[PDB]
């Protein structure tokens, strides 16, 4: 029984079939790491704002919505296509490697009310979550999400909760050891944050396996057979009643496309994507080394190919956010 | 047009005339400072919980509600009189003297939803605010209060905002220099936090003058005449449309009583009090030095006299929270 305004706002984030075919560019710390590979200087605010503007200007005509951060992304939000909706990120970027727990913390100048006043159709918040963590840590995380979920009810604005999994006992997310526990980490977190007390509207989540270790896709060690990986997608689908969409996690455009196909064939009725680096990552080096004009040209050719190829796959694979179990 | 449930909850916090005749004991850091004057050991959790229990057991029959903190005050909340309502504090105790700005920060395990689930009839949050501070500091404070105000709308629970004033240029609140600016600091903060965007239900505030420097009350220097002090109370009344109640700030029971009379004669239509140390402060030394039985005896004699004398003054001076301008 979702409120009329929350329904209306999620319609504004979705395409004409109800698929969330969204473009993600709220990267801050992560964008700076990408830029640091191609220049010796620290990135400027102006530089970062302008790169986000280029992506919004060139690619939002092909997206149903764009996710931006309010620290650098407000000029880009003004530049978005007239039919493209807006999500704004609410968490501070990254986490303190020297503090235990990756504890969640909102941007200090912002509230759900102020994000709505900037024109957001949704508030997005990223939480790092390990279901096996100490309860002393996880209680703080549950309480924090309850606050944000309550703010978004009062402000009558959809709450998109992004969950990224981790385990302090397995510090490398990309490892074989992490790949074995990932389905559990992802699916259990979804079960928890689907509880009504968190007031989440849409979950933005990882695919439950690391595809780099799935039979057929794997160039090295194989952690799961195709049958095993497919079952992890089925378990993910059963973990929530809420609409859920996938993040790209910086894999190649082609691997992300083949992942969505695999999810669909396995029986995950995912409702779209918030796809960032798989679409636009190549623009960063071009912008730095060649300049603005060359970056625009990259976005009009390769960027366009990446998002158009993605949209074609979504048409065949994704399910309206309104579909009910 | 307050919601039905918020109205019902504030009725539960008020007496049969609609006056908030409430008992405050959410002190944590401040209570420890009081206890440290009478023992060499650091206070224990068990010790602090039990002192709050004694106050709830002996005095809540004479109060319309009690304000407690969720860190030590939950056993005391269970012990309150059946007709006495409950407010729970949401902020961490005190502030970091080594960090600039006294920036607001909720208790990490709590949310408005969880406070409501403990049986609170209201959420109370303390904000330290200097209207003359840098905007870089104050924007964070406004954003933070907007979040809490929004949570309390969603959870349909009254939001009591306590404001304490300060000025980093005048580090001693109790000084003559601070006394001169206090009315401005207090009244301007009330004007700001009465804006609809903060969703405050009731303001808990300081009296706008330091009575220790008002003509007639002053033993030393006189900062304001009686006429001048009376006008500051009139300005306070005009600063808000919301119900507002006074905190005691640890003055004597008799001075607090004469302050409420002065406010009333000046034309401040205050709606009650959240009175803490003026009522129970003497119990702390007795509990530590003499023990539990002696503390109960103090509460049944002097404690009772203090709260009963206060209730008599409130009957003559305070206005229903429902009164409209
Ligand atoms: Zn390079
Ligand atoms: Zn993301
Ligand atoms: Zn198909
Ligand atoms: Zn003593
Ligand atoms: Zn107080
Ligand atoms: Zn009178």
XYZ file of C-alpha atoms and ligand atoms in Angstrom:
656
model
C 0.000 0.000 0.000
C 2.749 2.504 -1.029
C 1.844 6.193 -0.792
C 0.597 7.916 -3.969
C 3.578 10.290 -4.048
C 6.173 7.529 -3.568
C 4.539 5.618 -6.449
C 4.589 8.765 -8.613
C 8.245 9.409 -7.782
C 9.368 5.862 -8.641
C 7.425 6.166 -11.972
C 9.592 9.273 -12.660
C 12.724 7.140 -12.081
C 11.615 4.354 -14.431
C 11.166 3.928 -18.179
C 7.888 3.408 -20.094
C 7.858 -0.327 -19.155
C 8.423 0.348 -15.409
C 12.057 -0.794 -15.580
C 14.552 1.311 -13.595
C 17.073 1.840 -16.411
C 19.226 4.235 -14.444
C 22.644 5.809 -14.753
C 24.822 5.973 -11.591
C 27.403 8.721 -11.103
C 27.504 9.509 -7.382
C 31.132 8.308 -7.195
C 33.416 10.614 -5.231
C 36.342 8.848 -3.508
C 36.079 6.071 -6.108
C 36.150 8.568 -8.998
C 39.228 10.240 -7.491
C 41.042 6.874 -7.388
C 40.251 6.394 -11.099
C 41.485 9.899 -11.936
C 44.684 9.460 -9.862
C 45.837 6.739 -12.283
C 46.101 9.324 -15.077
C 47.349 12.525 -13.410
C 49.836 13.408 -10.711
C 47.736 16.268 -9.231
C 44.883 15.769 -6.779
C 41.540 16.278 -8.601
C 39.782 19.646 -8.242
C 36.134 20.202 -7.315
C 35.615 22.051 -10.633
C 37.141 19.134 -12.600
C 34.896 16.527 -10.910
C 31.738 18.683 -11.305
C 32.443 19.123 -15.015
C 32.989 15.390 -15.648
C 29.613 14.676 -14.052
C 28.070 17.423 -16.231
C 29.529 15.819 -19.394
C 28.017 12.429 -18.496
C 24.605 13.965 -17.673
C 24.596 16.074 -20.837
C 25.562 13.236 -23.189
C 23.914 10.146 -21.691
C 20.781 11.055 -19.677
C 18.672 11.059 -22.845
C 19.201 7.259 -22.750
C 18.467 6.734 -19.041
C 15.209 6.756 -17.075
C 17.019 8.429 -14.134
C 20.458 9.472 -12.907
C 21.917 8.999 -9.417
C 24.228 11.903 -8.410
C 25.845 13.075 -5.152
C 25.045 16.529 -3.743
C 28.746 17.397 -3.120
C 29.802 17.646 -6.782
C 26.741 16.530 -8.749
C 24.311 19.450 -8.443
C 25.396 21.185 -11.710
C 25.085 17.808 -13.474
C 21.560 17.422 -12.021
C 20.550 20.721 -13.662
C 21.964 19.461 -16.984
C 19.972 16.184 -17.080
C 17.498 15.407 -19.857
C 13.968 16.721 -19.179
C 12.554 13.156 -19.016
C 15.288 11.749 -16.776
C 14.499 11.496 -13.032
C 16.939 12.217 -10.171
C 18.235 10.243 -7.190
C 20.608 11.967 -4.747
C 23.083 10.120 -2.526
C 22.937 10.876 1.211
C 25.955 9.047 2.699
C 29.494 10.424 3.011
C 31.871 8.893 0.477
C 33.799 5.668 1.274
C 34.704 4.752 4.883
C 37.556 5.257 7.350
C 39.923 2.290 6.994
C 41.250 3.125 10.496
C 37.868 2.935 12.265
C 36.159 -0.401 13.035
C 32.765 -1.175 11.503
C 32.230 1.017 8.369
C 29.569 2.751 10.416
C 27.020 4.740 8.380
C 27.132 8.560 8.434
C 25.032 11.077 6.417
C 26.526 14.105 4.654
C 26.593 16.831 7.356
C 24.778 19.578 5.404
C 21.899 17.394 4.210
C 18.573 15.928 5.317
C 15.916 14.058 3.331
C 13.930 17.336 3.287
C 16.842 19.275 1.724
C 17.470 16.512 -0.875
C 13.792 16.671 -1.854
C 14.048 20.471 -2.064
C 16.915 20.068 -4.593
C 14.507 18.174 -6.817
C 15.416 14.570 -5.989
C 12.772 11.944 -6.867
C 14.482 9.562 -4.394
C 16.977 9.525 -1.559
C 19.727 6.905 -1.935
C 21.835 5.718 0.999
C 24.751 3.261 0.853
C 25.287 0.914 3.795
C 28.248 -1.439 4.178
C 26.881 -4.529 5.937
C 28.281 -7.811 7.194
C 25.507 -10.079 8.549
C 28.137 -11.941 10.620
C 29.484 -8.817 12.333
C 29.288 -8.215 16.095
C 25.817 -7.135 17.218
C 27.408 -4.046 18.884
C 28.244 -2.881 15.341
C 25.095 -4.060 13.551
C 22.647 -2.523 16.043
C 24.081 0.905 15.130
C 23.555 0.145 11.433
C 19.935 -0.999 11.911
C 19.142 2.061 14.047
C 20.714 4.363 11.444
C 18.689 2.927 8.563
C 15.504 3.195 10.657
C 16.159 6.961 10.998
C 16.600 7.473 7.250
C 13.612 5.281 6.394
C 11.489 7.350 8.796
C 12.711 10.689 7.316
C 11.722 9.454 3.828
C 8.250 8.456 5.011
C 7.700 11.970 6.461
C 9.110 13.711 3.356
C 7.101 11.278 1.185
C 10.091 10.469 -1.037
C 11.249 6.961 -2.110
C 14.096 5.479 -0.074
C 16.648 3.492 -2.154
C 18.943 1.501 0.130
C 22.171 0.295 -1.426
C 23.857 -2.527 0.442
C 27.508 -3.499 -0.137
C 28.754 -6.602 1.627
C 32.135 -7.198 3.267
C 33.807 -9.300 5.970
C 36.720 -8.067 8.088
C 37.977 -11.686 8.247
C 38.216 -11.733 4.423
C 39.571 -8.261 3.601
C 39.693 -8.759 -0.204
C 36.141 -8.687 -1.643
C 37.442 -9.867 -4.994
C 39.063 -13.062 -3.640
C 38.082 -16.732 -4.027
C 37.453 -16.927 -0.269
C 34.989 -14.002 -0.424
C 33.262 -15.438 -3.525
C 32.218 -18.521 -1.487
C 30.422 -16.487 1.210
C 29.085 -13.662 -1.005
C 25.630 -15.205 -1.750
C 24.941 -15.598 1.968
C 26.211 -12.066 2.755
C 24.088 -10.500 0.031
C 20.890 -12.539 0.434
C 20.800 -12.357 4.245
C 21.303 -8.580 4.207
C 18.371 -8.276 1.770
C 16.146 -10.374 4.059
C 16.953 -8.118 6.994
C 16.530 -4.768 5.257
C 13.254 -5.854 3.680
C 11.654 -5.767 7.173
C 8.910 -3.094 7.306
C 10.679 -1.181 10.140
C 13.366 0.028 7.691
C 10.817 1.617 5.340
C 12.907 0.807 2.253
C 11.225 1.310 -1.175
C 13.860 -0.224 -3.489
C 17.023 -2.203 -2.778
C 20.130 -1.591 -4.855
C 22.272 -4.698 -4.506
C 25.208 -6.738 -5.755
C 24.628 -9.825 -7.845
C 25.020 -12.638 -5.283
C 28.055 -14.307 -6.933
C 31.373 -13.084 -8.243
C 30.885 -13.906 -11.970
C 34.671 -14.049 -12.444
C 34.536 -17.458 -10.674
C 31.408 -18.944 -12.262
C 31.941 -21.919 -14.626
C 31.973 -20.721 -18.252
C 32.925 -17.165 -17.298
C 35.948 -18.163 -15.203
C 39.452 -17.854 -16.677
C 41.021 -19.289 -13.504
C 39.619 -21.167 -10.518
C 35.921 -22.093 -10.536
C 34.028 -21.436 -7.302
C 30.514 -22.228 -8.568
C 29.058 -24.299 -11.394
C 26.443 -22.654 -13.615
C 23.720 -24.591 -11.777
C 25.062 -23.436 -8.374
C 25.305 -19.786 -9.471
C 21.771 -19.925 -10.916
C 20.458 -21.192 -7.570
C 22.124 -18.250 -5.752
C 20.152 -15.894 -8.065
C 16.930 -17.803 -7.274
C 17.669 -17.456 -3.537
C 18.288 -13.710 -4.051
C 14.924 -13.295 -5.741
C 13.246 -15.093 -2.805
C 15.115 -12.956 -0.222
C 12.884 -9.878 -0.731
C 9.369 -8.737 -1.628
C 10.733 -5.286 -2.565
C 11.812 -4.191 -6.030
C 15.570 -4.670 -6.408
C 18.084 -3.396 -8.942
C 21.709 -4.290 -9.641
C 24.828 -2.162 -9.397
C 27.673 -2.883 -11.913
C 30.555 -2.881 -9.363
C 32.886 -1.609 -12.102
C 32.909 -4.757 -14.257
C 33.172 -4.322 -18.057
C 30.059 -3.284 -19.999
C 30.016 -6.737 -21.694
C 30.322 -8.742 -18.456
C 27.526 -6.693 -16.847
C 25.293 -7.389 -19.870
C 26.003 -11.141 -19.702
C 25.397 -11.059 -15.934
C 21.894 -9.573 -16.436
C 21.154 -12.265 -18.999
C 22.381 -14.947 -16.588
C 20.234 -13.493 -13.744
C 17.156 -13.466 -15.969
C 17.653 -17.070 -17.168
C 18.194 -18.184 -13.533
C 14.873 -16.687 -12.413
C 15.885 -13.459 -10.707
C 13.085 -10.988 -11.522
C 15.323 -7.960 -11.025
C 13.666 -4.613 -11.746
C 16.486 -2.758 -13.425
C 19.931 -1.364 -12.698
C 21.839 1.609 -11.388
C 24.778 1.215 -13.718
C 27.786 3.495 -13.327
C 31.384 2.580 -14.199
C 30.462 -0.208 -16.672
C 28.909 2.522 -18.838
C 31.175 5.610 -18.450
C 34.515 4.482 -16.947
C 36.481 4.985 -20.218
C 35.556 8.685 -20.313
C 37.719 9.475 -17.248
C 41.111 8.832 -18.870
C 40.029 10.607 -22.064
C 38.843 13.709 -20.205
C 42.128 13.973 -18.274
C 44.575 13.161 -21.058
C 42.801 14.472 -24.142
C 40.309 17.019 -22.789
C 36.631 17.919 -22.695
C 35.891 17.715 -26.441
C 37.494 14.278 -26.741
C 35.552 13.098 -23.666
C 32.281 14.255 -25.246
C 33.242 12.372 -28.400
C 33.967 9.221 -26.363
C 30.557 9.611 -24.646
C 28.802 9.975 -28.039
C 30.389 6.818 -29.419
C 31.584 4.260 -26.848
C 29.492 5.700 -23.957
C 26.413 5.640 -26.158
C 27.232 2.090 -27.339
C 27.605 0.935 -23.702
C 24.292 2.393 -22.468
C 22.381 1.468 -25.649
C 23.666 -2.147 -25.480
C 22.621 -2.208 -21.807
C 19.126 -0.855 -22.651
C 18.690 -3.611 -25.271
C 19.587 -6.262 -22.681
C 17.258 -4.647 -20.077
C 14.367 -4.754 -22.587
C 14.786 -8.563 -22.767
C 15.645 -9.275 -19.123
C 14.209 -6.768 -16.593
C 10.763 -6.722 -14.890
C 8.580 -3.710 -14.008
C 9.112 -2.521 -10.429
C 5.319 -2.896 -10.021
C 5.311 -6.692 -10.515
C 4.013 -8.612 -7.491
C 4.927 -12.099 -6.208
C -3.454 21.126 12.612
C -1.371 18.723 14.796
C -1.924 15.004 14.210
C -4.402 13.202 16.498
C -1.687 10.948 17.937
C 0.733 13.814 18.655
C -2.101 15.631 20.469
C -2.909 12.469 22.452
C 0.750 11.977 23.369
C 1.223 15.557 24.608
C -2.002 15.145 26.705
C -0.259 12.120 28.327
C 2.710 14.381 29.206
C 0.550 17.098 30.774
C -1.561 17.471 33.911
C -5.368 17.843 34.133
C -5.117 21.582 33.247
C -2.895 20.966 30.167
C 0.221 22.249 31.951
C 3.425 20.263 31.327
C 4.420 19.807 34.984
C 7.322 17.517 34.224
C 10.291 16.078 36.059
C 13.668 16.029 34.224
C 16.297 13.390 34.980
C 18.099 12.642 31.714
C 21.369 13.987 33.175
C 24.384 11.792 32.476
C 27.700 13.688 32.244
C 26.182 16.428 34.419
C 25.038 13.909 37.053
C 28.528 12.374 37.115
C 30.058 15.810 37.811
C 27.658 16.223 40.759
C 28.517 12.761 42.096
C 32.288 13.347 41.687
C 32.114 16.087 44.342
C 31.190 13.489 46.978
C 33.182 10.356 46.085
C 36.652 9.597 44.810
C 35.563 6.670 42.567
C 34.108 7.079 39.086
C 30.325 6.422 39.207
C 29.054 2.990 38.123
C 26.243 2.299 35.654
C 24.355 0.400 38.397
C 24.711 3.357 40.813
C 23.371 5.889 38.267
C 20.463 3.606 37.213
C 19.432 3.159 40.845
C 19.485 6.905 41.621
C 17.170 7.500 38.665
C 14.918 4.673 39.938
C 14.726 6.304 43.403
C 13.650 9.640 41.887
C 11.042 7.978 39.626
C 9.688 5.841 42.465
C 9.374 8.693 44.972
C 8.460 11.729 42.863
C 6.614 10.715 39.658
C 3.303 10.599 41.532
C 3.667 14.417 41.651
C 4.668 14.947 38.005
C 2.653 14.815 34.779
C 5.661 13.243 32.990
C 9.322 12.349 33.459
C 12.180 12.912 31.000
C 14.810 10.110 31.173
C 17.769 9.035 29.009
C 17.829 5.565 27.423
C 21.443 4.849 28.547
C 20.740 4.608 32.293
C 17.079 5.584 32.655
C 15.167 2.573 31.311
C 14.726 0.851 34.732
C 13.518 4.197 36.134
C 11.018 4.457 33.241
C 9.507 1.105 34.280
C 9.217 2.389 37.870
C 7.269 5.584 37.025
C 3.778 6.236 38.377
C 0.991 4.790 36.190
C -0.337 8.298 35.372
C 3.056 9.832 34.596
C 4.034 10.089 30.897
C 7.530 9.492 29.453
C 9.954 11.545 27.361
C 13.241 9.938 26.271
C 16.378 11.902 25.390
C 17.965 11.177 21.998
C 21.255 13.138 22.016
C 24.604 11.904 23.350
C 25.518 13.504 26.670
C 27.469 16.810 26.800
C 29.870 17.796 23.980
C 33.545 17.426 23.073
C 35.377 20.481 24.432
C 38.175 19.733 21.915
C 35.953 19.806 18.808
C 34.645 23.078 17.317
C 30.898 23.703 17.143
C 29.092 21.463 19.718
C 27.714 19.644 16.706
C 24.601 17.537 17.389
C 24.875 13.725 17.428
C 22.192 11.108 18.302
C 22.847 8.125 20.578
C 24.235 5.429 18.224
C 21.844 2.594 19.171
C 18.652 4.652 18.915
C 16.131 5.995 16.411
C 12.792 7.740 16.964
C 11.131 4.385 16.138
C 13.097 2.548 18.866
C 12.373 5.310 21.441
C 8.659 4.996 20.655
C 8.942 1.207 20.993
C 10.339 1.699 24.541
C 7.113 3.476 25.420
C 8.155 7.120 25.058
C 5.298 9.632 24.622
C 7.846 12.103 23.165
C 11.349 12.265 21.764
C 13.526 14.988 23.316
C 16.683 16.284 21.640
C 19.119 18.853 23.064
C 20.833 21.248 20.660
C 23.553 23.719 21.634
C 23.007 26.770 19.418
C 24.693 30.116 18.898
C 22.743 32.285 16.415
C 25.949 34.269 15.738
C 28.047 31.217 14.847
C 29.596 30.643 11.409
C 27.052 29.438 8.849
C 29.344 26.430 8.111
C 28.535 25.265 11.661
C 24.874 26.303 11.824
C 23.878 24.693 8.509
C 24.880 21.316 10.003
C 22.710 22.020 13.057
C 19.655 23.025 10.984
C 20.033 19.955 8.749
C 20.350 17.693 11.803
C 17.187 19.021 13.445
C 15.305 18.647 10.140
C 16.191 14.913 10.167
C 14.911 14.383 13.715
C 11.775 16.448 13.108
C 11.050 14.319 10.026
C 11.602 11.017 11.930
C 9.095 12.179 14.583
C 6.496 13.050 11.950
C 6.800 9.531 10.441
C 6.723 7.818 13.864
C 3.856 10.149 14.870
C 5.484 11.054 18.195
C 5.893 14.596 19.643
C 9.292 16.208 19.098
C 10.548 18.274 22.088
C 13.546 20.376 21.069
C 15.673 21.694 23.904
C 17.908 24.597 22.973
C 20.863 25.707 25.129
C 22.647 28.874 24.090
C 26.378 29.619 24.149
C 29.006 31.810 22.473
C 32.608 30.714 21.911
C 33.657 34.380 22.303
C 32.141 34.401 25.822
C 33.114 30.978 27.200
C 31.484 31.445 30.645
C 27.670 31.219 30.324
C 27.270 32.417 33.890
C 29.200 35.687 33.385
C 28.005 39.311 33.252
C 29.135 39.516 29.614
C 26.985 36.495 28.666
C 23.988 37.832 30.639
C 23.856 40.890 28.320
C 23.554 38.813 25.122
C 21.474 35.917 26.520
C 17.997 37.315 25.609
C 19.047 37.715 21.978
C 20.674 34.243 21.882
C 17.613 32.569 23.369
C 14.865 34.485 21.545
C 16.513 34.335 18.106
C 17.094 30.581 18.403
C 13.392 30.138 19.255
C 12.360 32.167 16.188
C 14.494 29.973 13.956
C 13.464 26.593 15.346
C 9.790 27.534 15.262
C 9.945 27.416 11.424
C 7.665 24.638 10.091
C 10.598 22.824 8.381
C 11.934 21.699 11.790
C 8.662 19.988 12.751
C 9.099 20.851 16.442
C 6.071 20.250 18.744
C 7.313 21.865 21.984
C 10.375 23.974 22.761
C 12.230 23.465 26.023
C 14.174 26.657 26.650
C 16.146 28.800 29.072
C 14.563 31.842 30.645
C 15.958 34.692 28.509
C 17.852 36.465 31.337
C 20.266 35.361 34.017
C 18.115 36.128 37.113
C 21.269 36.416 39.245
C 21.814 39.833 37.573
C 18.250 41.179 37.563
C 17.540 44.151 39.884
C 15.977 42.921 43.144
C 17.397 39.415 42.757
C 20.998 40.551 42.245
C 23.468 40.367 45.145
C 26.242 41.892 43.010
C 26.268 43.742 39.695
C 22.928 44.520 38.032
C 22.727 43.819 34.298
C 18.992 44.460 33.832
C 16.336 46.446 35.676
C 13.067 44.677 36.491
C 11.394 46.523 33.603
C 14.173 45.454 31.184
C 14.039 41.806 32.307
C 10.230 41.792 31.998
C 10.522 43.037 28.409
C 12.944 40.181 27.566
C 10.235 37.727 28.761
C 7.645 39.515 26.583
C 10.005 39.232 23.586
C 10.473 35.509 24.359
C 6.728 34.945 24.351
C 6.487 36.704 20.957
C 9.405 34.667 19.517
C 7.308 31.498 18.992
C 3.815 30.210 18.215
C 4.743 26.808 19.700
C 4.183 25.723 23.289
C 7.343 26.347 25.319
C 8.489 25.149 28.728
C 11.369 26.180 30.980
C 14.343 24.178 32.192
C 15.713 24.988 35.715
C 19.434 25.123 34.742
C 20.324 23.919 38.250
C 19.247 27.045 40.153
C 17.781 26.585 43.667
C 14.171 25.406 44.003
C 13.230 28.838 45.462
C 14.886 30.885 42.693
C 13.203 28.742 40.014
C 9.819 29.321 41.696
C 10.380 33.099 41.831
C 11.545 33.029 38.196
C 8.255 31.401 37.076
C 6.331 34.037 39.003
C 8.408 36.788 37.381
C 7.837 35.278 33.887
C 4.090 35.109 34.482
C 3.848 38.718 35.741
C 5.929 39.886 32.733
C 3.534 38.270 30.248
C 5.334 35.101 29.213
C 2.568 32.513 28.699
C 4.907 29.581 29.295
C 3.237 26.164 29.221
C 5.065 24.407 32.011
C 8.519 23.157 32.932
C 10.929 20.274 32.653
C 12.479 20.762 36.056
C 15.427 18.606 37.087
C 18.204 19.655 39.483
C 16.154 22.381 41.246
C 13.900 19.570 42.502
C 16.217 16.578 43.209
C 19.828 17.851 43.366
C 20.122 17.396 47.178
C 19.401 13.661 46.879
C 22.744 12.986 45.130
C 25.009 13.748 48.103
C 22.672 11.901 50.480
C 22.578 8.772 48.315
C 26.388 8.657 48.079
C 27.279 9.538 51.660
C 24.357 8.129 53.623
C 22.847 5.499 51.313
C 19.648 4.454 49.576
C 17.288 4.594 52.582
C 18.445 8.088 53.541
C 18.057 9.220 49.910
C 14.473 7.920 49.853
C 13.831 9.809 53.082
C 15.273 13.006 51.563
C 13.024 12.498 48.494
C 9.941 12.033 50.732
C 10.608 15.236 52.650
C 12.733 17.864 50.872
C 12.232 16.369 47.363
C 8.491 16.288 47.934
C 8.547 19.856 49.324
C 10.477 21.059 46.237
C 8.139 19.483 43.653
C 4.963 20.301 45.619
C 6.042 23.966 46.014
C 6.767 24.020 42.266
C 3.325 22.523 41.452
C 1.644 25.234 43.566
C 3.508 27.943 41.635
C 2.672 26.262 38.276
C -1.042 26.230 39.208
C -0.900 30.051 39.522
C 1.483 30.831 36.652
C 1.446 28.293 33.770
C -0.855 28.127 30.695
C -2.283 25.040 28.950
C -0.145 23.906 26.008
C -3.356 24.136 23.927
C -3.736 27.923 24.329
C -3.603 29.819 21.026
C -2.346 33.351 20.263
Zn 46.429 7.085 -18.396
Zn 26.536 2.570 -5.779
Zn 13.582 -14.407 -21.291
Zn 29.895 15.707 50.066
Zn 17.686 19.552 29.780
Zn -1.538 35.857 37.606
